[PDB]
């Protein structure tokens, strides 16, 4: 058994390199989206008449 | 085969009193049945012979 | 208990008319909880002048203890949608029945 | 921003899936506030959502 | 026809012709097992997938004659397509809409009656009553409880053969042909499902729900009744619970009493006779319980006391390798011990012949109001921990532990003669009078077992002798836990020898149960 | 200011909030971590541990074996499966001495286990390695297959039913000179194949794991099975063990042990607990052991039960590892891909692998024989975990003062993969002592406990199984949250399961309230969704919502409609027990009632009891209604059988003579086509009778029935 | 079977003991047990089960 | 997400050897209370003969 | 099976199939397929004398 008493402790080791790229499916946080406050328009609901 | 063509379980009610005929019992097991003559029943069946046996154990 | 002992035609207890706005089934256990405590006294000896039913789920049920509305300062509960005074209504009107003159 | 991506079934079904994510959150703070409740004996609805 | 015909093509090839005469119909069943498909993996991906498609709903043939293939907006509802592996056209969801919007109509009067659980269910719901909340520390004990009130505690193999001539008049077995109880409930179904069109096995599944009896392991902190277990989740919380009762119809039945007034009057009976076993045997052959022989109801019942027990054992069964001492289930769990004889001067000039226990064993026990455990060494106890609902059933249960500990202790501590004798007046075993003396009075042996003092620590508490909680002294292994003990989880079930005094015996040569330590109570037959 | 919810565990302890530091709900989209290489370094690494013992060459297979048993003591920490017999039998007599009667009874069981089973549980297996097509396959098919080559080859003891049965013809075949198997080519023109396997080479297809974690063939799989519920049965009168209890059990176990442990200390003794993990589990248990502990358990037993029993451990002491598919080669200058099967990979050059894949084939060369590497000492997982978890209990068991003959001593639970030893003694002194003692002991049995994966923390706080233990408070993340998607049965069976899983969730899973609603309407959505079944109200133009909308506006009670036929949903904490169509019967309208229930639809279908009104996942049994919405949903889709739906085929047209047959297991002597026979005769006859069957019926029914007794007497 | 034919019997008592046995084996195959009951009979033995 | 995942799959099912052009939209509740419709982007999927 | 047999014939019968085995020096728990034998020759016997 040995002794853990707050000094044994180290912080983790990350790993060097370059900086990490982004990898998500899709944009988060730089998102932009083209706005139509109310869709009251002819044939409406099918996505390809929204978009 | 003597006794007739087989018959439905459903239909063994128009037999006479001690008429015997065949039936199908089970999943598709045809035997020859009849109907009861002496009020008993196989509860009683060997308890005679239990108790004689017993006794000659003993 | 002399008195109940001078009858001999009881039945399994069942409910024929049932409380519409209220608990049925726990009258029948308390019922049922009612006779086997008078026999269980039978059973005694040195029986005390009364007996004190024990506390049961049934029992308090059919008493209203857990149907009782709690106790809270207003401040605590205000903030509730159907927090309304007491029903301080006029009950509704009901016709005239003939079983009262029978009474 | 255009990008070349590839999705498989699974992971098609593990994005619809997200939803769930919700409860998770749930999960973790009511268990905190019930626990609070145990140890006084009283709601702590109102006293964490609105103090 | 079409059945003949198929069975003619089937012959006609060699292997269908052969697998059909090989095989008898005892294994036919083992012959379903045999399916070269492939289970479909992650099957609600699959659904998801499916529902996209344009006819993923397979219907039957007989679909092309009702349901037209287009509806007023051109829709196509059932495509000129078959299924793989059969003949079942394909149709879309719009089929099946299209039926419930437009489809013949007819009468669901046996719907109801198919159905009573679950409208049975609905009843209980409806009619029931509802209590404030209260938010306080729960504790779940855990337990076996019932599932699906309504049963009538059938065995599966009844509820099959009720099932049978129910909803199969003309396929019965032999057993039904060469049987003569016609239980009352099943011509009560027969006359209830005269003109019943719903799919027959349907039918017989539901009956099998409806009279069969289900228990399962749950951890319950208030009512345990099987109306109670239904609305488990509605009742009860990590840190709050509800007050509810339900408004149908319950239907506790008093059979298990009769059995236990039963065997106690033939074991009180027996033990004097000269021959307790075979005339035991006979009587239990011979007797009806309600309408029924008592031997259904002990192979059936799952009943646990020491009549009941040592009825089995005389007759030759398996039952719990345990003892239900002093209104508490015992269950050794660790350790071993030997039983020795011997004479033990009590403090009032008694001497008594008793059988002690000596080795490092360990017990857990379970009584109505409390759950302890007890490890006790060689005519030394160790260490005792209880944890009960009110004081006194920690202080039954404690001088119930004591008293089997048979330590030399308490012995001198004594105090009164020691002649209790039951309602029969057959002289009352050391232990059991002990246990009796102790229960009228025990301040004198409390103020002369011993004391010391403990360590606090949380989640447990000290007990004064005068049974009052205690953080800083308490007596000698006595301890109480402040928060609920999970009862046992298991039985072990092991092969017993019975002596003629009705004496179960161990294979190890210890004795187990016996009719002294049975309760001499009289009850009423209900 | 940054986000930083580690910083939580400052107030909030771990125990408390451990749900956050469990990333995933559900399974995650990948399932990486598997092939070939992966095989290879676990034969290199098990032939490692114990390599110190004795070299032997088998005379069946002729594969060189090892034996580390009875090898010299380990010298050094790191994992060794040097483990000596003796002390295995002594802690096995200790451990029947602490519980006499338990070998006994649980022999007895066995017994009774191995006289009633039958062959087709074989078929409730997961995936097998079939050696007759050599490649994995369904249990059920693989099992069809092995009994048509069984069949072929002249072996038709498993034709009596038994699967003790079916172990005696895989013995006969095994000593059998020569198998032949035959395959036909489906497809253009079909033909026949006939294939020719000497001794040795059925005997290493026999013992052989296909890897892709491994998983042996149809010869292995009774053995093991009858070993695991021997295993089973003595594993559940051990109060110190962990399987095969749920999880309600697991609970009072650890309650159990940790207050018994803690309470008995006096005021002057210590008290530590040991949360544990094993180095490798697997990787150290010898057969030999195995078989050392099982002749132990087995004493005084008749012949038979022994060897049913020994030959598993016997099996697998000699068996083989498959090498998967292959390798792939890809070359840049053509963009030119090619795999190699691992067949080859005996005698392949060794420059188009890297180092480590270099260093890997030349190790398990040598060990290489017929395409698979005979890998004697070890084991692999999910066949042999309750006997090791015996092993283990044995082991703790030892622990007991009287046994150590001084002051220390030890108890705890112990689940195979994992385990939380607790030690008292006086000093810590005599905790250290205690638990050098265990640790040594266990590494004689031939048990490593991984050092780096177990920490001692004084009494009161633990892990166990994915259970965390602190000061009483036991929380369970075992399997984390559930999937509350729809099921994928069909309408009426998803929204049942979805409700059921939401209210057991509630009762077992510890789920809240506020939880259980948000859950519900999650749920609700996500079938709304899928089933295309919208309310009929709102606008979201599927394809169903015409015909939705069309019935909306015909009813009257539009509260009365089911979720799937557009009505509004009314579940709640309150009835989540309550099938949909009883919960909202008394609001149906009476012409929608009448359709919706009707029993005449062609969109309702029922299979056999086992699959009625249940669900396999584990499996989960819920109640609904059998209406309409009911359906069954469209199926997707070198054989031995010449027809792989001859059975099915069979049995179908048995349901038809007789419906029974689909309830429950018909029983008779007869043949079957004399049932359907004599069935068909009564029924046509009776039919003629009534006045619906005129004379050309008759006449034809009784030609054919006439012609089927003579095809089936000849 | 019996010589000659001579069953002393009545009809009734043979078709009691036919029935008896007839319904045993049906309980003992319902059971999963009539296969090694068959089995185990030799000739005019019954002999241990053997592996 | 959900949306996104959802009209692939759709699409994918439904247009088995078609390249559709699906578009990224999503609804929302603005403080107004009106029913809002986003367009992050366009989506298009290659050959969805997945088995 | 020995379960089987226990519970469907007599309890007598059981005896003294058990009796009769024992003479021989063996063990109904480690044979049944001769317990089960006998007891079916013992309720024959008996069925067949009686009520005569
Ligand atoms: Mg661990």
Redesign the pocket.
Same mark, same amino acid.
């Given at each position: 058994i040995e002794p853990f008493l707050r000094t044994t402790p180290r912080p983790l080791r990350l790993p060097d390199g370059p900086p990490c790229s982004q990898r998500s499916k899709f944009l988060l946080m730089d998102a932009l989206k083209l706005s139509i406050e109310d869709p009251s328009h002819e044939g409406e609901g099918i996505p390809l008449y929204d978009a | 085969k003597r006794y007739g063509p087989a018959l439905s379980i459903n239909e063994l009610s128009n037999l006479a009193k001690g008429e015997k005929a065949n039936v199908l019992i089970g999943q598709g097991d045809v035997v020859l049945v009849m109907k009861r003559k002496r009020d008993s029943s196989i509860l009683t069946d060997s308890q005679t012979a239990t108790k004689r046996i017993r006794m000659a154990i003993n | 208990i002399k008195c109940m002992k001078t009858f001999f035609g009881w039945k399994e207890p069942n409910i024929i008319k049932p409380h519409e706005k209220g608990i049925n089934p726990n009258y029948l256990l308390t019922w049922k909880q009612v006779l086997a405590e008078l026999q269980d006294i039978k059973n005694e000896e040195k029986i005390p002048r009364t007996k004190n039913m024990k506390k049961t789920s049934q029992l308090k049920w059919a008493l209203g203890e857990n149907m009782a509305p709690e106790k809270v300062d207003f401040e605590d509960c205000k903030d509730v949608n159907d927090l309304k005074q007491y029903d301080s209504d006029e009950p509704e009107p009901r016709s005239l029945a003939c079983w009262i003159q029978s009474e | 921003y255009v990008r070349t991506n590839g999705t498989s079934k699974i992971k098609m079904k593990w994005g619809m899936e997200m939803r769930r994510c919700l409860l998770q959150s749930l999960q973790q703070i009511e268990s905190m506030i019930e626990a609070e409740s145990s140890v006084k004996e009283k709601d702590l609805t109102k006293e964490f959502f609105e103090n | 026809m079409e059945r003949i015909k198929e069975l003619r093509d089937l012959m006609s090839q060699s292997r269908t012709r052969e697998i059909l005469t090989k095989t008898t119909v005892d294994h036919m069943a083992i012959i379903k097992k045999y399916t070269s498909g492939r289970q479909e993996k992650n099957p609600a991906l699959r659904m998801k997938w499916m529902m996209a498609m344009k006819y993923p709903i397979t219907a039957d043939k007989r679909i092309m004659e009702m349901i037209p293939e287009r509806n007023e907006q051109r829709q196509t509802l059932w495509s000129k397509t078959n299924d793989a592996g059969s003949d079942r056209v394909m149709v879309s969801p719009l089929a099946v809409t299209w039926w419930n919007r437009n489809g013949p109509t007819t009468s669901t009067v046996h719907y109801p009656k198919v159905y009573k659980t679950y409208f049975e269910k609905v009843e209980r719901l409806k009619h029931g009553t509802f209590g404030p909340v209260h938010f306080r520390n729960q504790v779940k004990i855990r337990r076996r409880v019932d599932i699906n009130p309504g049963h009538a505690d059938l065995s599966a193999k009844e509820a099959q053969d009720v099932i049978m001539e129910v909803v199969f008049p003309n396929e019965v077995g032999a057993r039904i042909l060469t049987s003569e109880s016609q239980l009352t409930i099943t011509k009560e179904k027969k006359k209830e499902l005269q003109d019943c069109k719903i799919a027959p096995l349907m039918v017989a599944y539901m009956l099998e729900r409806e009279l069969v009896r289900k228990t399962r392991f749950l951890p319950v902190a208030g009512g345990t009744s099987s109306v109670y277990i239904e609305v488990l989740h509605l009742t009860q919380g990590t840190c709050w619970e509800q007050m509810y009762t339900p408004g149908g119809e319950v239907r506790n039945d008093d059979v298990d009493q009769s059995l236990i007034i039963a065997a106690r009057n033939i074991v009180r009976r027996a033990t004097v006779s000269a021959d307790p076993l075979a005339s035991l045997l006979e009587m239990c052959h011979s007797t009806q319980i309600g309408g029924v022989r008592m031997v259904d109801i002990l192979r059936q019942n799952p009943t646990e006391e020491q009549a009941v027990d040592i009825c089995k054992a005389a007759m030759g069964l398996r039952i719990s390798s345990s003892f239900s001492f002093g209104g508490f289930t015992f269950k050794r769990t660790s350790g071993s011990s030997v039983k020795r004889e011997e004479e033990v001067l009590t403090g009032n000039l008694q001497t008594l012949k008793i059988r002690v226990h000596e080795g490092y064993e360990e017990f857990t026990m379970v009584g109505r109001r409390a759950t302890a455990i007890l490890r006790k060494a060689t005519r030394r106890l160790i260490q005792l921990i209880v944890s009960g609902k009110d004081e006194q059933s920690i202080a039954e249960a404690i001088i119930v532990a004591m008293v089997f500990s048979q330590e030399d202790c308490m012995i001198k501590a004594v105090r009164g003669d020691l002649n209790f004798v039951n309602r029969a007046n057959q002289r009352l075993n050391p232990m059991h009078q002990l246990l009796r003396h102790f229960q009228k009075d025990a301040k004198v042996l409390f103020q002369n077992w011993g004391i010391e003092p403990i360590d606090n620590v949380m989640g447990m508490i000290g007990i004064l002798p005068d049974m009052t909680p205690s953080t800083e002294m308490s007596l000698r292994g006595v301890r109480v836990s402040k928060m609920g003990v999970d009862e046992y989880s298991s039985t072990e079930r092991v092969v017993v020898s019975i002596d003629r005094f009705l004496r179960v015996r161990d294979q190890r040569g210890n004795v187990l149960l016996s009719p002294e330590e049975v309760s001499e109570t009289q009850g009423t037959e209900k | 200011m940054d986000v930083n919810p580690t910083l939580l565990f400052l107030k909030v302890p771990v125990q408390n909030a451990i749900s956050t530091t469990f990333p995933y709900t559900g399974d995650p989209p990948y399932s990486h971590g598997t092939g070939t290489g992966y095989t290879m370094d676990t034969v290199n690494r098990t032939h490692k541990y114990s390599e110190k013992g004795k070299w032997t060459t088998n005379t069946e297979t002729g594969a060189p074996q090892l034996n580390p048993i009875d090898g010299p003591l380990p010298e050094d920490n790191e994992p060794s499966g040097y483990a000596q017999t003796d002390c295995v039998l002594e802690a096995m007599a200790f451990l029947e001495e602490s519980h006499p009667g338990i070998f006994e009874n649980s022999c007895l069981e066995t017994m009774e286990i191995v006289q009633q089973t039958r062959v087709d549980k074989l078929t409730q297996g997961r995936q097998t390695y079939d050696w007759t097509l050599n490649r994995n396959q369904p249990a059920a098919t693989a099992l069809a297959n092995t009994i048509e080559v069984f069949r072929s080859n002249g072996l038709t003891a498993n034709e009596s039913g038994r699967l003790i049965d079916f172990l005696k013809d895989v013995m006969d075949s095994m000593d059998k000179e020569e198998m032949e198997i035959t395959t036909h080519f489906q497809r253009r023109t079909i033909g026949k194949k006939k294939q020719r396997l000497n001794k040795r080479s059925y005997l290493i297809r026999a013992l052989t794991l296909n890897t892709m974690i491994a998983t042996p063939g149809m010869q292995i799989r009774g053995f093991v099975y009858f070993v695991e519920a021997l295993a089973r049965s003595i594993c559940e009168k051990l109060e110190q063990s962990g399987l095969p209890v749920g999880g309600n059990e697991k609970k009072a176990k650890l309650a159990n042990v940790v207050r018994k442990m803690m309470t008995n200390s006096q005021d002057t003794e210590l008290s530590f607990t040991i949360?544990?993990?094993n180095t490798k589990w697997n990787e150290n248990q010898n057969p030999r052991m195995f078989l050392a502990m099982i002749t132990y358990i087995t004493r005084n037993q008749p012949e038979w039960f022994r060897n049913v029993l020994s030959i598993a451990p016997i099996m697998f002491s000699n068996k083989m590892a498959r090498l998967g598919k292959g390798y792939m080669f890809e070359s840049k200058s053509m963009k030119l891909r090619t795999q190699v099967p691992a067949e080859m990979l005996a005698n392949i050059d060794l420059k188009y692998f890297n180092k480590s894949t270099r260093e890997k084939i030349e190790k398990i060369r040598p060990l290489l024989i017929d395409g698979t590497a005979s890998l004697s000492p070890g084991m692999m997982m999910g066949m042999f975990n309750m006997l090791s978890t015996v092993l283990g209990v044995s082991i703790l068991n030892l622990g007991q003062k009287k046994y150590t003959k001084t002051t220390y001593w030890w108890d705890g639970l112990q689940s195979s993969d994992? *385990?939380?030893l607790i030690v008292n003694a006086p000093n810590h002194e005599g905790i250290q002592a205690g638990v050098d003692r265990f640790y040594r002991t266990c590494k004689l049995v031939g048990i490593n406990m991984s050092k780096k994966?177990?920490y001692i923390n004084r009494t009161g706080t633990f892990? *166990?199984?994915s259970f965390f233990y602190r000061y009483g408070f036991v929380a369970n993340f075992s399997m984390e949250l559930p999937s509350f998607g729809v099921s994928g049965i069909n309408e009426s069976a998803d929204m049942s399961v979805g409700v059921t899983v939401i209210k057991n969730n509630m009762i077992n899973n510890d789920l809240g309230p506020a939880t259980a609603q948000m859950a519900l309407q999650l749920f609700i959505k996500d079938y709304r969704y899928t089933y295309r079944c919208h309310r009929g109200d709102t606008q979201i133009q599927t394809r169903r919502a015409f015909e939705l909308g069309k019935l909306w506006e015909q009813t009257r009670s539009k509260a009365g409609l089911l979720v799937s036929d557009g009505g509004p949903n009314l579940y709640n904490i309150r009835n989540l027990h309550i099938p949909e169509v009883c919960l909202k019967w008394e609001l149906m309208d009476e012409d929608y009632q009448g359709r919706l229930c009707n029993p005449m639809n062609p969109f309702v279908s029922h299979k056999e009891i086992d699959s009625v009104n249940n669900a396999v996942v584990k499996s989960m049994e819920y109640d609904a209604v059998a209406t309409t919405h009911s359906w069954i949903p469209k199926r997707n889709r070198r054989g031995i059988l010449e027809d792989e739906q001859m059975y099915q085929k069979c049995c179908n047209l048995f349901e038809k003579f007789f419906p029974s047959s689909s309830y429950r297991r018909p029983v008779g002597i007869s043949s079957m086509v004399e049932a359907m026979v004599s069935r068909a005769r009564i029924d046509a006859r009776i039919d003629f009778e009534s006045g619906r069957i005129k004379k050309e019926e008759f006449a034809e029914i009784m030609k054919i029935c006439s012609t089927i007794e003579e095809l089936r007497r000849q | 079977m019996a010589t000659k034919a001579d069953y002393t019997l009545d009809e009734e008592s043979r078709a009691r003991i036919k029935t008896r046995l007839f319904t045993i084996r049906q309980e003992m195959a319902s059971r999963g047990l009539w296969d090694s009951f068959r089995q185990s009979e030799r000739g005019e033995e019954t002999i241990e089960e053997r592996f | 997400g959900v949306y996104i995942n959802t009209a692939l799959l759709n699409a994918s099912c439904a247009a088995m050897d078609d390249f559709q052009l699906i578009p990224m939209i999503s609804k929302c509740i603005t403080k107004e209370g009106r029913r809002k419709t986003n367009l992050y982007g366009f989506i298009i999927k290659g050959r969805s003969h997945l088995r | 099976m020995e379960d089987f047999v226990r519970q469907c014939f007599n309890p007598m019968i059981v005896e003294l199939a058990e009796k009769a085995m024992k003479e021989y020096g063996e063990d109904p728990k480690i044979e049944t397929n001769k317990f089960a034998s006998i007891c079916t020759h013992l309720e024959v016997c008996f069925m067949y004398s009686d009520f005569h």
């Amino acid at each position: 058994i040995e002794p853990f008493l707050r000094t044994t402790p180290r912080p983790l080791r990350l790993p060097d390199g370059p900086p990490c790229s982004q990898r998500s499916k899709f944009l988060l946080m730089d998102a932009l989206k083209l706005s139509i406050e109310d869709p009251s328009h002819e044939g409406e609901g099918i996505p390809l008449y929204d978009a | 085969k003597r006794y007739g063509p087989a018959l439905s379980i459903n239909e063994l009610s128009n037999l006479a009193k001690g008429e015997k005929a065949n039936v199908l019992i089970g999943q598709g097991d045809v035997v020859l049945v009849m109907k009861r003559k002496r009020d008993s029943s196989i509860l009683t069946d060997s308890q005679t012979a239990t108790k004689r046996i017993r006794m000659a154990i003993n | 208990i002399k008195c109940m002992k001078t009858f001999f035609g009881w039945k399994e207890p069942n409910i024929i008319k049932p409380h519409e706005k209220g608990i049925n089934p726990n009258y029948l256990l308390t019922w049922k909880q009612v006779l086997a405590e008078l026999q269980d006294i039978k059973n005694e000896e040195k029986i005390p002048r009364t007996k004190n039913m024990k506390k049961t789920s049934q029992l308090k049920w059919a008493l209203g203890e857990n149907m009782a509305p709690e106790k809270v300062d207003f401040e605590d509960c205000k903030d509730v949608n159907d927090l309304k005074q007491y029903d301080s209504d006029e009950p509704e009107p009901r016709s005239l029945a003939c079983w009262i003159q029978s009474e | 921003y255009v990008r070349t991506n590839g999705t498989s079934k699974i992971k098609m079904k593990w994005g619809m899936e997200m939803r769930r994510c919700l409860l998770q959150s749930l999960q973790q703070i009511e268990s905190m506030i019930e626990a609070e409740s145990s140890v006084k004996e009283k709601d702590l609805t109102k006293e964490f959502f609105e103090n | 026809m079409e059945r003949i015909k198929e069975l003619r093509d089937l012959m006609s090839q060699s292997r269908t012709r052969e697998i059909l005469t090989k095989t008898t119909v005892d294994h036919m069943a083992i012959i379903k097992k045999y399916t070269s498909g492939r289970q479909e993996k992650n099957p609600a991906l699959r659904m998801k997938w499916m529902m996209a498609m344009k006819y993923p709903i397979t219907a039957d043939k007989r679909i092309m004659e009702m349901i037209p293939e287009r509806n007023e907006q051109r829709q196509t509802l059932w495509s000129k397509t078959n299924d793989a592996g059969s003949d079942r056209v394909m149709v879309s969801p719009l089929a099946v809409t299209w039926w419930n919007r437009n489809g013949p109509t007819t009468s669901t009067v046996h719907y109801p009656k198919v159905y009573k659980t679950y409208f049975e269910k609905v009843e209980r719901l409806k009619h029931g009553t509802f209590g404030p909340v209260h938010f306080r520390n729960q504790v779940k004990i855990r337990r076996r409880v019932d599932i699906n009130p309504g049963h009538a505690d059938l065995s599966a193999k009844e509820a099959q053969d009720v099932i049978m001539e129910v909803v199969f008049p003309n396929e019965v077995g032999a057993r039904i042909l060469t049987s003569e109880s016609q239980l009352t409930i099943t011509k009560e179904k027969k006359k209830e499902l005269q003109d019943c069109k719903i799919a027959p096995l349907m039918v017989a599944y539901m009956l099998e729900r409806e009279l069969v009896r289900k228990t399962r392991f749950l951890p319950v902190a208030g009512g345990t009744s099987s109306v109670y277990i239904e609305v488990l989740h509605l009742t009860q919380g990590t840190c709050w619970e509800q007050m509810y009762t339900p408004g149908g119809e319950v239907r506790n039945d008093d059979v298990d009493q009769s059995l236990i007034i039963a065997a106690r009057n033939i074991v009180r009976r027996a033990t004097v006779s000269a021959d307790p076993l075979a005339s035991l045997l006979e009587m239990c052959h011979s007797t009806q319980i309600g309408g029924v022989r008592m031997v259904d109801i002990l192979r059936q019942n799952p009943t646990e006391e020491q009549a009941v027990d040592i009825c089995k054992a005389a007759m030759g069964l398996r039952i719990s390798s345990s003892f239900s001492f002093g209104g508490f289930t015992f269950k050794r769990t660790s350790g071993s011990s030997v039983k020795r004889e011997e004479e033990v001067l009590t403090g009032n000039l008694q001497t008594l012949k008793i059988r002690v226990h000596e080795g490092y064993e360990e017990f857990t026990m379970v009584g109505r109001r409390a759950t302890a455990i007890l490890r006790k060494a060689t005519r030394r106890l160790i260490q005792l921990i209880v944890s009960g609902k009110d004081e006194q059933s920690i202080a039954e249960a404690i001088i119930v532990a004591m008293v089997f500990s048979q330590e030399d202790c308490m012995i001198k501590a004594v105090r009164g003669d020691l002649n209790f004798v039951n309602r029969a007046n057959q002289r009352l075993n050391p232990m059991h009078q002990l246990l009796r003396h102790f229960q009228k009075d025990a301040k004198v042996l409390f103020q002369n077992w011993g004391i010391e003092p403990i360590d606090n620590v949380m989640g447990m508490i000290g007990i004064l002798p005068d049974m009052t909680p205690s953080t800083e002294m308490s007596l000698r292994g006595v301890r109480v836990s402040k928060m609920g003990v999970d009862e046992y989880s298991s039985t072990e079930r092991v092969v017993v020898s019975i002596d003629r005094f009705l004496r179960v015996r161990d294979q190890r040569g210890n004795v187990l149960l016996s009719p002294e330590e049975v309760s001499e109570t009289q009850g009423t037959e209900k | 200011m940054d986000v930083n919810p580690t910083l939580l565990f400052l107030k909030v302890p771990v125990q408390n909030a451990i749900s956050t530091t469990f990333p995933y709900t559900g399974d995650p989209p990948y399932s990486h971590g598997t092939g070939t290489g992966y095989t290879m370094d676990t034969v290199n690494r098990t032939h490692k541990y114990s390599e110190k013992g004795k070299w032997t060459t088998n005379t069946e297979t002729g594969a060189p074996q090892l034996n580390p048993i009875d090898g010299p003591l380990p010298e050094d920490n790191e994992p060794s499966g040097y483990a000596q017999t003796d002390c295995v039998l002594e802690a096995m007599a200790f451990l029947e001495e602490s519980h006499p009667g338990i070998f006994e009874n649980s022999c007895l069981e066995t017994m009774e286990i191995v006289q009633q089973t039958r062959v087709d549980k074989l078929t409730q297996g997961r995936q097998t390695y079939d050696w007759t097509l050599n490649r994995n396959q369904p249990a059920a098919t693989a099992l069809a297959n092995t009994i048509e080559v069984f069949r072929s080859n002249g072996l038709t003891a498993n034709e009596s039913g038994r699967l003790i049965d079916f172990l005696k013809d895989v013995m006969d075949s095994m000593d059998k000179e020569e198998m032949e198997i035959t395959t036909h080519f489906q497809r253009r023109t079909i033909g026949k194949k006939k294939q020719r396997l000497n001794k040795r080479s059925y005997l290493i297809r026999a013992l052989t794991l296909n890897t892709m974690i491994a998983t042996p063939g149809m010869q292995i799989r009774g053995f093991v099975y009858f070993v695991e519920a021997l295993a089973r049965s003595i594993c559940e009168k051990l109060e110190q063990s962990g399987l095969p209890v749920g999880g309600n059990e697991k609970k009072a176990k650890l309650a159990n042990v940790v207050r018994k442990m803690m309470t008995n200390s006096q005021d002057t003794e210590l008290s530590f607990t040991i949360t544990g993990d094993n180095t490798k589990w697997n990787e150290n248990q010898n057969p030999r052991m195995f078989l050392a502990m099982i002749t132990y358990i087995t004493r005084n037993q008749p012949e038979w039960f022994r060897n049913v029993l020994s030959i598993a451990p016997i099996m697998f002491s000699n068996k083989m590892a498959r090498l998967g598919k292959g390798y792939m080669f890809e070359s840049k200058s053509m963009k030119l891909r090619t795999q190699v099967p691992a067949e080859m990979l005996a005698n392949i050059d060794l420059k188009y692998f890297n180092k480590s894949t270099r260093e890997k084939i030349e190790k398990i060369r040598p060990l290489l024989i017929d395409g698979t590497a005979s890998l004697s000492p070890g084991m692999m997982m999910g066949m042999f975990n309750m006997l090791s978890t015996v092993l283990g209990v044995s082991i703790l068991n030892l622990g007991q003062k009287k046994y150590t003959k001084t002051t220390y001593w030890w108890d705890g639970l112990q689940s195979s993969d994992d *385990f939380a030893l607790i030690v008292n003694a006086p000093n810590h002194e005599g905790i250290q002592a205690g638990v050098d003692r265990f640790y040594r002991t266990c590494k004689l049995v031939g048990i490593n406990m991984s050092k780096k994966k177990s920490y001692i923390n004084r009494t009161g706080t633990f892990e *166990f199984t994915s259970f965390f233990y602190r000061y009483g408070f036991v929380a369970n993340f075992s399997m984390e949250l559930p999937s509350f998607g729809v099921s994928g049965i069909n309408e009426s069976a998803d929204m049942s399961v979805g409700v059921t899983v939401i209210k057991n969730n509630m009762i077992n899973n510890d789920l809240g309230p506020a939880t259980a609603q948000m859950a519900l309407q999650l749920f609700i959505k996500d079938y709304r969704y899928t089933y295309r079944c919208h309310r009929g109200d709102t606008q979201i133009q599927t394809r169903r919502a015409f015909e939705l909308g069309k019935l909306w506006e015909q009813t009257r009670s539009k509260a009365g409609l089911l979720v799937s036929d557009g009505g509004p949903n009314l579940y709640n904490i309150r009835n989540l027990h309550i099938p949909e169509v009883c919960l909202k019967w008394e609001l149906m309208d009476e012409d929608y009632q009448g359709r919706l229930c009707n029993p005449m639809n062609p969109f309702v279908s029922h299979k056999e009891i086992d699959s009625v009104n249940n669900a396999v996942v584990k499996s989960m049994e819920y109640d609904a209604v059998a209406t309409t919405h009911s359906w069954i949903p469209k199926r997707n889709r070198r054989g031995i059988l010449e027809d792989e739906q001859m059975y099915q085929k069979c049995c179908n047209l048995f349901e038809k003579f007789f419906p029974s047959s689909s309830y429950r297991r018909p029983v008779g002597i007869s043949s079957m086509v004399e049932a359907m026979v004599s069935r068909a005769r009564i029924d046509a006859r009776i039919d003629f009778e009534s006045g619906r069957i005129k004379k050309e019926e008759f006449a034809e029914i009784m030609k054919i029935c006439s012609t089927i007794e003579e095809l089936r007497r000849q | 079977m019996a010589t000659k034919a001579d069953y002393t019997l009545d009809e009734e008592s043979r078709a009691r003991i036919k029935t008896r046995l007839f319904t045993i084996r049906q309980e003992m195959a319902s059971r999963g047990l009539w296969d090694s009951f068959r089995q185990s009979e030799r000739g005019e033995e019954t002999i241990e089960e053997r592996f | 997400g959900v949306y996104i995942n959802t009209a692939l799959l759709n699409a994918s099912c439904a247009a088995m050897d078609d390249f559709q052009l699906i578009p990224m939209i999503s609804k929302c509740i603005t403080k107004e209370g009106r029913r809002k419709t986003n367009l992050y982007g366009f989506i298009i999927k290659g050959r969805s003969h997945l088995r | 099976m020995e379960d089987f047999v226990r519970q469907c014939f007599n309890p007598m019968i059981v005896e003294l199939a058990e009796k009769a085995m024992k003479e021989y020096g063996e063990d109904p728990k480690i044979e049944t397929n001769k317990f089960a034998s006998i007891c079916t020759h013992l309720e024959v016997c008996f069925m067949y004398s009686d009520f005569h």
